[PDB]
mmCIF file of C-alpha atoms and ligand atoms in Angstrom:
data_model
loop_
_atom_site.group_PDB
_atom_site.id
_atom_site.type_symbol
_atom_site.label_atom_id
_atom_site.label_comp_id
_atom_site.label_asym_id
_atom_site.label_seq_id
_atom_site.Cartn_x
_atom_site.Cartn_y
_atom_site.Cartn_z
ATOM 1 C CA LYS X 1 -5.198 1.238 -23.517
ATOM 2 C CA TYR X 2 -6.707 2.212 -19.917
ATOM 3 C CA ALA X 3 -6.388 5.311 -17.659
ATOM 4 C CA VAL X 4 -4.345 5.064 -14.476
ATOM 5 C CA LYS X 5 -5.866 4.299 -11.293
ATOM 6 C CA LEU X 6 -4.954 7.057 -8.516
ATOM 7 C CA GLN X 7 -6.318 5.008 -5.411
ATOM 8 C CA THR X 8 -3.323 4.260 -3.286
ATOM 9 C CA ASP X 9 -2.759 1.092 -1.104
ATOM 10 C CA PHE X 10 0.195 1.989 1.230
ATOM 11 C CA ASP X 11 -0.525 -0.702 3.870
ATOM 12 C CA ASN X 12 -0.437 -3.427 1.239
ATOM 13 C CA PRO X 13 2.655 -5.856 2.066
ATOM 14 C CA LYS X 14 3.218 -5.956 -1.762
ATOM 15 C CA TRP X 15 3.645 -2.117 -2.121
ATOM 16 C CA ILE X 16 5.948 -2.157 0.954
ATOM 17 C CA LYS X 17 8.188 -4.986 -0.287
ATOM 18 C CA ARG X 18 8.572 -3.360 -3.506
ATOM 19 C CA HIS X 19 10.094 -0.380 -1.849
ATOM 20 C CA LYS X 20 12.052 -2.510 0.436
ATOM 21 C CA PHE X 21 13.356 -4.382 -2.577
ATOM 22 C CA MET X 22 14.613 -1.019 -3.882
ATOM 23 C CA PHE X 23 15.822 0.386 -0.734
ATOM 24 C CA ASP X 24 18.166 -2.570 -0.357
ATOM 25 C CA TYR X 25 19.383 -2.303 -3.916
ATOM 26 C CA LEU X 26 20.092 1.573 -3.126
ATOM 27 C CA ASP X 27 21.757 0.366 0.310
ATOM 28 C CA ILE X 28 25.034 -0.978 -1.538
ATOM 29 C CA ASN X 29 26.821 -1.590 1.804
ATOM 30 C CA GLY X 30 23.805 -2.728 3.408
ATOM 31 C CA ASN X 31 24.339 -0.665 6.239
ATOM 32 C CA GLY X 32 20.628 0.041 6.553
ATOM 33 C CA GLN X 33 20.634 3.501 5.255
ATOM 34 C CA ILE X 34 21.171 5.755 2.661
ATOM 35 C CA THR X 35 21.832 9.495 1.878
ATOM 36 C CA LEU X 36 20.989 11.904 -0.813
ATOM 37 C CA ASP X 37 24.588 12.032 -1.540
ATOM 38 C CA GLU X 38 24.805 8.550 -2.375
ATOM 39 C CA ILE X 39 21.618 8.802 -4.692
ATOM 40 C CA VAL X 40 23.192 11.837 -6.458
ATOM 41 C CA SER X 41 26.470 10.040 -6.914
ATOM 42 C CA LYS X 42 24.797 7.107 -8.399
ATOM 43 C CA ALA X 43 22.828 9.437 -10.735
ATOM 44 C CA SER X 44 25.551 11.965 -11.787
ATOM 45 C CA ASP X 45 29.113 10.049 -11.247
ATOM 46 C CA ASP X 46 28.029 6.687 -12.251
ATOM 47 C CA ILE X 47 24.948 6.529 -14.612
ATOM 48 C CA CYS X 48 25.415 9.921 -16.507
ATOM 49 C CA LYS X 49 29.010 9.533 -16.771
ATOM 50 C CA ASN X 50 28.840 5.904 -17.987
ATOM 51 C CA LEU X 51 25.874 6.818 -20.604
ATOM 52 C CA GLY X 52 28.012 9.731 -21.864
ATOM 53 C CA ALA X 53 25.599 12.507 -20.729
ATOM 54 C CA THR X 54 26.778 16.081 -21.450
ATOM 55 C CA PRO X 55 27.349 18.283 -18.622
ATOM 56 C CA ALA X 56 24.121 20.108 -19.015
ATOM 57 C CA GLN X 57 22.227 16.831 -19.286
ATOM 58 C CA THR X 58 23.875 15.472 -16.149
ATOM 59 C CA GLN X 59 23.006 18.668 -14.224
ATOM 60 C CA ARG X 60 19.447 18.651 -15.234
ATOM 61 C CA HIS X 61 19.144 14.776 -14.280
ATOM 62 C CA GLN X 62 20.689 15.617 -10.963
ATOM 63 C CA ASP X 63 18.476 18.411 -10.351
ATOM 64 C CA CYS X 64 15.455 16.147 -10.966
ATOM 65 C CA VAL X 65 16.784 13.221 -8.942
ATOM 66 C CA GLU X 66 17.480 15.507 -5.796
ATOM 67 C CA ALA X 67 14.066 16.921 -6.143
ATOM 68 C CA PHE X 68 12.399 13.399 -6.390
ATOM 69 C CA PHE X 69 14.332 11.469 -3.228
ATOM 70 C CA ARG X 70 13.621 15.017 -1.306
ATOM 71 C CA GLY X 71 10.152 14.239 -2.234
ATOM 72 C CA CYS X 72 10.285 10.855 -0.284
ATOM 73 C CA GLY X 73 12.434 12.259 2.681
ATOM 74 C CA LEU X 74 15.937 12.121 1.546
ATOM 75 C CA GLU X 75 18.500 15.079 2.096
ATOM 76 C CA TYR X 76 22.185 15.710 1.843
ATOM 77 C CA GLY X 77 24.220 14.857 4.786
ATOM 78 C CA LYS X 78 21.224 12.733 6.321
ATOM 79 C CA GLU X 79 20.894 9.200 6.973
ATOM 80 C CA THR X 80 17.474 7.668 5.931
ATOM 81 C CA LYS X 81 16.451 4.356 7.305
ATOM 82 C CA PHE X 82 13.845 2.089 5.670
ATOM 83 C CA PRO X 83 10.974 3.383 8.027
ATOM 84 C CA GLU X 84 11.514 7.074 7.119
ATOM 85 C CA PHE X 85 12.182 6.015 3.515
ATOM 86 C CA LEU X 86 8.646 4.437 3.261
ATOM 87 C CA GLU X 87 6.978 7.222 4.918
ATOM 88 C CA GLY X 88 8.508 9.368 2.400
ATOM 89 C CA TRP X 89 7.123 7.446 -0.475
ATOM 90 C CA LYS X 90 3.694 7.830 0.980
ATOM 91 C CA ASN X 91 4.087 11.646 0.897
ATOM 92 C CA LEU X 92 5.555 11.634 -2.382
ATOM 93 C CA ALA X 93 2.852 9.325 -3.764
ATOM 94 C CA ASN X 94 0.103 11.578 -2.116
ATOM 95 C CA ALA X 95 1.888 14.769 -3.593
ATOM 96 C CA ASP X 96 2.554 13.576 -6.940
ATOM 97 C CA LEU X 97 -0.943 12.203 -7.253
ATOM 98 C CA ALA X 98 -2.230 15.440 -6.302
ATOM 99 C CA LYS X 99 -0.110 17.281 -8.891
ATOM 100 C CA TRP X 100 -1.406 14.781 -11.528
ATOM 101 C CA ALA X 101 -5.077 15.386 -10.403
ATOM 102 C CA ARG X 102 -4.634 18.977 -11.227
ATOM 103 C CA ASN X 103 -2.454 18.456 -14.492
ATOM 104 C CA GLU X 104 0.538 19.597 -13.188
ATOM 105 C CA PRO X 105 3.680 17.863 -14.098
ATOM 106 C CA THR X 106 4.860 15.186 -11.519
ATOM 107 C CA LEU X 107 8.343 14.647 -10.115
ATOM 108 C CA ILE X 108 8.140 11.326 -11.619
ATOM 109 C CA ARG X 109 7.557 12.831 -15.035
ATOM 110 C CA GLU X 110 10.354 15.247 -14.752
ATOM 111 C CA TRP X 111 12.755 12.551 -13.652
ATOM 112 C CA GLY X 112 11.475 10.761 -16.881
ATOM 113 C CA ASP X 113 12.289 13.600 -18.953
ATOM 114 C CA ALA X 114 15.663 14.085 -17.817
ATOM 115 C CA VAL X 115 16.596 10.235 -18.364
ATOM 116 C CA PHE X 116 15.129 10.418 -21.845
ATOM 117 C CA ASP X 117 17.191 13.512 -22.812
ATOM 118 C CA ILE X 118 20.517 11.702 -22.390
ATOM 119 C CA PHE X 119 19.297 9.481 -25.340
ATOM 120 C CA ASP X 120 17.871 12.113 -27.383
ATOM 121 C CA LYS X 121 20.469 13.086 -29.786
ATOM 122 C CA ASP X 122 18.276 13.094 -32.870
ATOM 123 C CA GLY X 123 15.006 14.687 -31.771
ATOM 124 C CA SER X 124 13.013 11.342 -31.333
ATOM 125 C CA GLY X 125 12.328 12.009 -27.657
ATOM 126 C CA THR X 126 12.197 8.259 -27.040
ATOM 127 C CA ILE X 127 14.143 5.277 -25.787
ATOM 128 C CA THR X 128 14.709 1.996 -27.937
ATOM 129 C CA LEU X 129 14.935 -1.395 -26.349
ATOM 130 C CA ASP X 130 18.699 -1.073 -26.711
ATOM 131 C CA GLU X 131 19.339 2.126 -24.969
ATOM 132 C CA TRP X 132 17.061 0.763 -22.044
ATOM 133 C CA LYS X 133 19.047 -2.408 -21.687
ATOM 134 C CA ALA X 134 21.971 0.051 -21.345
ATOM 135 C CA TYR X 135 20.248 2.010 -18.669
ATOM 136 C CA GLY X 136 19.057 -1.258 -16.674
ATOM 137 C CA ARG X 137 22.720 -2.518 -16.696
ATOM 138 C CA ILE X 138 24.217 0.778 -15.725
ATOM 139 C CA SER X 139 21.697 1.782 -13.195
ATOM 140 C CA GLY X 140 21.291 -1.609 -11.873
ATOM 141 C CA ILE X 141 17.687 -1.536 -11.783
ATOM 142 C CA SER X 142 17.405 -4.202 -14.499
ATOM 143 C CA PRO X 143 20.457 -5.858 -15.394
ATOM 144 C CA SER X 144 18.881 -8.822 -17.024
ATOM 145 C CA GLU X 145 18.734 -8.337 -20.801
ATOM 146 C CA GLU X 146 15.672 -10.331 -20.628
ATOM 147 C CA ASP X 147 13.761 -8.176 -18.027
ATOM 148 C CA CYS X 148 14.063 -5.226 -20.172
ATOM 149 C CA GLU X 149 12.792 -6.996 -23.135
ATOM 150 C CA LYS X 150 9.762 -7.832 -20.943
ATOM 151 C CA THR X 151 9.674 -3.864 -20.085
ATOM 152 C CA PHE X 152 9.011 -3.218 -23.737
ATOM 153 C CA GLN X 153 6.375 -6.072 -23.973
ATOM 154 C CA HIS X 154 4.856 -4.834 -21.072
ATOM 155 C CA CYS X 155 4.704 -1.305 -22.313
ATOM 156 C CA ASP X 156 2.579 0.326 -25.069
ATOM 157 C CA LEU X 157 5.192 1.133 -27.507
ATOM 158 C CA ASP X 158 5.048 3.962 -30.436
ATOM 159 C CA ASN X 159 4.997 3.159 -34.278
ATOM 160 C CA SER X 160 8.465 2.536 -34.078
ATOM 161 C CA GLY X 161 8.616 0.082 -31.346
ATOM 162 C CA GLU X 162 10.296 2.612 -29.036
ATOM 163 C CA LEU X 163 9.255 3.803 -25.768
ATOM 164 C CA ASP X 164 8.193 7.318 -24.831
ATOM 165 C CA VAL X 165 8.307 9.239 -21.698
ATOM 166 C CA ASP X 166 4.373 9.549 -21.461
ATOM 167 C CA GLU X 167 3.793 5.704 -21.377
ATOM 168 C CA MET X 168 6.745 5.137 -18.858
ATOM 169 C CA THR X 169 5.396 7.746 -16.632
ATOM 170 C CA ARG X 170 1.883 5.968 -16.619
ATOM 171 C CA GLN X 171 3.677 2.872 -15.969
ATOM 172 C CA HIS X 172 5.549 4.355 -12.918
ATOM 173 C CA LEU X 173 2.770 6.086 -11.565
ATOM 174 C CA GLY X 174 1.073 2.552 -10.880
ATOM 175 C CA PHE X 175 4.469 0.751 -10.365
ATOM 176 C CA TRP X 176 5.776 2.959 -7.467
ATOM 177 C CA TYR X 177 2.736 5.016 -6.320
ATOM 178 C CA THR X 178 -0.536 3.030 -6.627
ATOM 179 C CA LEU X 179 0.612 -0.503 -6.686
ATOM 180 C CA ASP X 180 -1.600 -0.947 -9.901
ATOM 181 C CA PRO X 181 -2.078 -4.396 -11.072
ATOM 182 C CA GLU X 182 -1.738 -3.283 -14.708
ATOM 183 C CA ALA X 183 1.927 -2.098 -13.815
ATOM 184 C CA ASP X 184 2.923 -5.408 -12.523
ATOM 185 C CA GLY X 185 5.748 -6.575 -14.541
ATOM 186 C CA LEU X 186 6.961 -3.251 -15.420
ATOM 187 C CA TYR X 187 10.536 -4.495 -14.765
ATOM 188 C CA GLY X 188 10.129 -8.137 -15.848
ATOM 189 C CA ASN X 189 11.284 -10.491 -13.001
ATOM 190 C CA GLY X 190 13.797 -7.771 -12.065
ATOM 191 C CA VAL X 191 11.538 -5.920 -9.405
ATOM 192 C CA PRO X 192 8.580 -7.428 -7.519
HETATM 193 O O1 LIG W 1 12.038 5.133 -12.257
HETATM 194 C C1 LIG W 1 13.323 4.873 -12.179
HETATM 195 N N1 LIG W 1 13.967 4.519 -10.909
HETATM 196 C C2 LIG W 1 12.922 4.288 -9.595
HETATM 197 C C3 LIG W 1 13.966 4.067 -8.344
HETATM 198 C C4 LIG W 1 13.307 3.545 -7.359
HETATM 199 C C5 LIG W 1 14.352 3.901 -5.983
HETATM 200 C C6 LIG W 1 13.839 3.729 -4.657
HETATM 201 C C7 LIG W 1 12.181 3.253 -4.544
HETATM 202 O O2 LIG W 1 11.946 3.026 -3.156
HETATM 203 C C8 LIG W 1 11.639 2.749 -5.739
HETATM 204 C C9 LIG W 1 11.929 3.207 -7.183
HETATM 205 N N2 LIG W 1 15.349 4.031 -8.755
HETATM 206 C C10 LIG W 1 15.990 4.110 -9.839
HETATM 207 C C11 LIG W 1 17.619 3.975 -10.009
HETATM 208 C C12 LIG W 1 18.093 5.280 -9.467
HETATM 209 C C13 LIG W 1 18.190 5.417 -8.102
HETATM 210 C C14 LIG W 1 18.836 6.716 -7.726
HETATM 211 C C15 LIG W 1 19.602 7.352 -8.609
HETATM 212 C C16 LIG W 1 19.780 7.217 -9.880
HETATM 213 C C17 LIG W 1 19.127 5.752 -10.449
HETATM 214 C C18 LIG W 1 15.179 4.367 -11.040
HETATM 215 N N3 LIG W 1 15.388 4.625 -12.385
HETATM 216 C C19 LIG W 1 14.360 4.908 -12.919
HETATM 217 C C20 LIG W 1 14.511 6.443 -13.722
HETATM 218 C C21 LIG W 1 13.144 6.670 -14.494
HETATM 219 C C22 LIG W 1 12.109 7.555 -13.982
HETATM 220 C C23 LIG W 1 11.054 8.012 -14.906
HETATM 221 C C24 LIG W 1 11.084 7.561 -16.318
HETATM 222 O O3 LIG W 1 10.003 7.784 -17.052
HETATM 223 C C25 LIG W 1 11.965 6.611 -16.838
HETATM 224 C C26 LIG W 1 13.269 6.256 -15.996
HETATM 225 O O4 LIG W 1 14.487 3.990 -14.151
HETATM 226 O O5 LIG W 1 13.530 2.834 -14.063
#
């Protein structure tokens, strides 16, 4: 196991292409713009509803999603195009990396906590391969049952073969923020 690299690379076509792929994935209608309203609706009225989240869990998850995407520029009643979106990610990456460097919880970690809570009815605090496939399909970020397995092959699992928020946060920092080579493949062949 290795530490995460905090060095950014916002100019790398690979990092920009990754967020472009996701932006397009979020831009359902392909109108070239998204709104915090769509992101929150996807989070609360789609994902949380279909996973069977309680009212409380759904609210906490919404609060975290709202804070996260506000981090990268989004806002209610405001259309955000890719250019602004990308610039938003640079600021968020910088802001979250600054918090990590001071041992303050990051927005990416807090989003993770909300997601894991939905699958934590017994106290384990982890997510099993089967629950991730569920999340992958419902959220649409990894509908491929195969890619989800690759996610679990890629990540370091606990003694039960289960994924915990600490490891997933490590991976996401590298995948979404630093374009760390060690993170490549986190989502299988589903996200470049
Ligand atoms: O990381 C995640 N995501 C990143 C992006 C995303 C979006 C745009 C970009 O440019 C880059 C990345 N989009 C979605 C899907 C989603 C979007 C909006 C509302 C709800 C869900 C998403 N779901 C997560 C949630 C998560 C977070 C931390 C964890 O430890 C575990 C799980 O799972 O991997």
